[PDB]
């Protein structure tokens, strides 16, 4: 199983962004999943009462799409990944560097969903002001953020991170409990991940994935001390050359 250090030395942020998040008009599997991720988040953060002062995004990678709806609903976002190369790609964008990945076709899509109340430039600006800290995280540690002191969070969001970081169910469950330690009682956990997936590809590089179904996922969440508010399974897969998943899931849970 892909160890922590394989992420340090072989996860190329740029390549990853190119292969999954380019969001072209050709209706490929990777674009379809992205559309569904965005609609989920929109529905979670805008249409439901999922709001508060602080959101901690766990395993952001070099991607910022997952925070476009969330910035409307949280005054402060803290982003975290285990890999500095990913935090640097993400900082390129937060500092609006001309060499940052083009997110604009994704930014326009999220503006659409919310009835174009805001223009692109203002959607982007709002997110940049929401992101207060960019931190090293490690879901396997019982203090995932290590030394860094944060107040209790209103929400923890993790997208396609947990299947990647955890080699087994004990580890997956402990991670969820580890993540729980950053949460207010009654606070929100939001996860979306691949179903029954044992690998994903970035260019030439293969990356291990923990293949779990809806039953294991849900049981691991409940066991970790969460109460499941809702849970959704979708059939849509990645391209067969890219991952071997049967689908994806979303859940919103509350801490006890
Ligand atoms: N032990 C660990 N703790 C925290 N993050 C980890 C981790 N092991 C792997 N990761 C991170 O999990 C991420 C999976 S790539 C997914 C990134 C992003 N959320 C997206 O939706 O595209 C990688 O960025 C990697 O750094
Ligand atoms: C597009 O990014 C991802 C796709 C599929 C993954 C999986 N575990 O199947 C993980 N992952 C990070």
Asked if residue 81 belongs to a known ligand binding site, the reply is: yes
Residue 146 Cα to ligand 2 middle (Å): 25
Which residue's CA is the nearest one to ligand 2's atom 3? 160
* 138 assigned binding-site residue: yes
CA of 247 to the centre of ligand 2 (A): 11
Cα angle vertex 16, ends 18, 188, to 5°?
A: 115
For residue 198, the 8-state DSSP code is -
Pocket of ligand 1, candidates 40, 61, 146: which has the most ligand atoms within 8 Å of its Cβ, to mutate?
61
| Pocket probe mutation, ligand 2, options 164, 167, 207, max atoms within 8 Å of Cβ | 164
Does the annotation list 193 as a binding residue? yes
**Residues near 93 by beta carbon (within 8 Å), at least 6 away in sequence:** 64, 100, 101, 103
Report the separation in Å between the CA atom of 15 and the middle of ligand 2, taken as the mean of its atom positions. 14
Ligand 1 atom closest to residue 60's alpha carbon, by position in its atom list? 19
Distance CA 192, CA 250 (A): 4
CA-wise closest residue to 16 among 67, 66, 61: 61
The reply to whether ligand 2 has any atom less than 6 angstroms from the CB of 200 is yes
Q: Which of 41, 85, 20 is nearest to 242 (CA)?
A: 20
Closest listed residue to residue 91, CA positions, set 120, 55, 64? 64
Residue boundaries of the structural domains of the chain: 1-256
Confirm or reject: Cβ of 34 under 6 Å from ligand 2.
Answer: no
CATH class name, domain 1-256: alpha beta
Q: Is 21 in the pocket of ligand 2 (CB under 6 A)?
A: no
Q: With b meaning 16 or more CB within 10 Å and e meaning fewer, what string describes 111-140?
A: bebeeeebeeeebbeebeebbeebbebbbe
User: Is residue 15 annotated as involved in ligand binding?
Assistant: no
**Is 21 annotated as belonging to a binding site?**
yes
Helices (H), 95-188: 104-113, 120-130, 162-165, 169-180
- Beta strands at 247-255 and 183-195: parallel, antiparallel or unpaired: antiparallel
CA distance 193 to 208: 14
Atom of ligand 1 nearest to the CA of 139: 3
Q: How was this structure determined?
A: X-ray
User: Which CA distances in Å does 89 have to 15, 99, 138?
Assistant: 11, 9, 18
């Amino acid at each position: 199983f892909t160890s922590k250090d394989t992420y340090l030395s072989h996860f190329n942020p740029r390549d990853y962004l190119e292969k999954y998040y380019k969001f072209g008009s050709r209706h490929s599997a990777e674009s379809q999943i992205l559309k569904h991720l965005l609609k989920n988040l929109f529905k979670i953060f805008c249409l439901d009462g999922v709001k508060g002062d602080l959101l901690i995004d766990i395993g952001s990678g070099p991607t910022i799409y997952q925070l476009l709806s969330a910035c409307e609903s949280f005054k402060e976002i803290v982003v975290t990944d285990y890999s500095d190369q990913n935090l640097q790609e993400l900082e390129k964008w937060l500092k609006a560097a001309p060499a940052a990945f083009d997110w604009s076709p994704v930014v326009t899509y999220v503006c659409d969903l919310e009835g174009n109340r805001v223009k692109g430039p203002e959607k982007e600006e709002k997110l940049r002001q929401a992101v207060k800290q960019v931190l090293k995280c490690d879901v396997t540690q019982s203090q995932p953020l290590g030394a860094v002191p944060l107040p209790p969070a209103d929400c923890v969001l993790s997208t396609l991170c947990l299947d990647a970081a955890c080699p087994d169910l004990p580890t997956y469950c402990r991670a969820l409990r580890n993540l729980g330690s950053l949460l207010k009682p009654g606070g929100f956990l939001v996860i979306m991940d691949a179903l029954k997936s044992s690998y994903y590809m970035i260019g030439e590089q293969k990356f291990s994935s923990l293949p779990l179904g809806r039953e294991a996922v849900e049981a691991a969440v409940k066991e970790a001390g969460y109460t499941i508010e809702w849970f959704e399974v979708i059939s849509q897969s990645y391209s067969s050359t890219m991952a071997n998943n049967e689908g994806l899931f979303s859940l919103v849970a509350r801490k006890l």
